[PDB]
Amino acid sequence: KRAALIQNLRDSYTETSSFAVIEEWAAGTLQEIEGIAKAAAEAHGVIRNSTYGRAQAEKSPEQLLGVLQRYQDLCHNVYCQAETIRTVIAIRIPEHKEEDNLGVAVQHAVLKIIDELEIKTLGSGEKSGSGGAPTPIGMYALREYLSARSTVEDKLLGGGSQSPSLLLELRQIDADFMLKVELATTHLSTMVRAVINAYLLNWKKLIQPRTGTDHMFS
């Protein structure tokens, strides 16, 4: 029975599903983003006041790994939660028509900034667009960091490289990846606040994109 199937979809992902997510973003999530911002700024201060010798090519700083893993855990949750809102909207896009699409326009409008959050901000894809990656750092930031550092680590350990700048680059990899988290957290906060506002102002048309009788007809 076709209506039963649609009803099941919608009973499972209701407007209180997507609202749950938005309440959480307004409270918990924005606070946890700020904590990661402060963890990363602090790590960046330690690295700024450090002279790096070969000693530093021999262990990976656990303070930085912690800040990076912690941000990756946030991005993981924000994405899954985004995908709840997106499910709640996507399963209520009504029959295709060339008319009565005022609400459907609100629906595509809001799906568009959830797309931006997921793809462009949480940098969650295998590959970027030909628009690039405008976000400072991805979901796979931990792996970008370890990969970038280990190339520098090998050249420094081996006869290790005698390049003074290559040693300073090991430090700049550590500095920059902490800066990249501060920047990515600032920007993720804006995006989250923007989706909070875009949702709460548009939620009615997101659930019922078409209403109205046939009052004119009998």
């Binding site: 009788t213 004119m216 007809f217 009998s218």
Partner: protein, 227 residues
């Protein structure tokens, strides 16, 4: 492209804007008419929007004169306007000739007014279909008429959302010259076949006329005996 003005033909020779008017007719309540032994009848469903509405008001079956009636479907304001044109047109004919010999001509006049609004830019068509049923000097008559100004004479027909349901049921079940009571029962039965089960048929309108008489509107109690 060819879709947006009443005066524009498509390359296949269609007037979509008129075809679109025809979709407005599908949004109305279902009504039907049929000929039986020495007469014709109409039955109409009705949206009852609320219990705060007044029942004995804005009727779907409307008398044009004592011997002719119409039911309509589609945009209600358009329908009202067309029914009053129908009534004034009827009285002009009576004043000119003293009587209405052939109902087909009243219908044509109404259909021509409708056709006119499918040809001159600056107006949209009436989003309305009508069934006219009455007795004239030919005999019992049953016509329908749509936004395009198209006319047909039937033994039985219907208009509204449930049209297709009701026309199939009748294609299978209709016979000519039934007695009034059986004709009305076939009609109620046909009408029910267009509902979506669960959904049940409240008090509908029923009017009937037989040769040598005036029209006769069934009251809600008389109607109830068939539910």
């Amino acid at each position: 492209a060819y879709d947006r003005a009443i005066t524009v033909f498509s390359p296949d020779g269609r007037l979509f804007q008129v075809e679109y008017a025809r979709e407005a007719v599908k949004k109305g309540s279902t009504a039907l008419g049929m000929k039986f032994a020495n007469g014709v009848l109409l039955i109409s469903d009705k949206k009852v929007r609320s219990r705060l509405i007044e029942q004995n008001s804005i009727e779907k079956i409307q008398l044009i004169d004592d011997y002719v009636a119409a039911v309509t479907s589609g945009l209600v304001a358009d329908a009202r306007v067309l029914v009053d044109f129908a009534r004034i047109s009827a009285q002009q004919e009576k004043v000119t000739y003293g009587s209405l010999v052939n109902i087909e001509n009243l219908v044509k006049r109404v259909a021509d007014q409708m056709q006119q609004y499918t040809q001159y830019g600056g107006v949209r068509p009436y989003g309305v279909s009508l069934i006219f049923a009455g007795i004239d000097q030919i005999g019992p008559r049953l016509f329908d008429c749509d936004p395009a100004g198209t006319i047909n004479e039937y033994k039985a027909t219907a208009i509204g959302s449930g049209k297709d349901a009701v026309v199939s049921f009748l294609e299978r079940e209709y016979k000519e010259n039934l007695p009034e009571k059986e004709a009305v029962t076939l009609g109620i039965k046909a009408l029910k076949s267009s509902l979506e089960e669960g959904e049940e048929l409240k008090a509908p309108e029923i009017a009937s006329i037989t040769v040598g008489n005036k029209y006769r509107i069934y009251d809600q109690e008389e109607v109830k005996k068939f539910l």
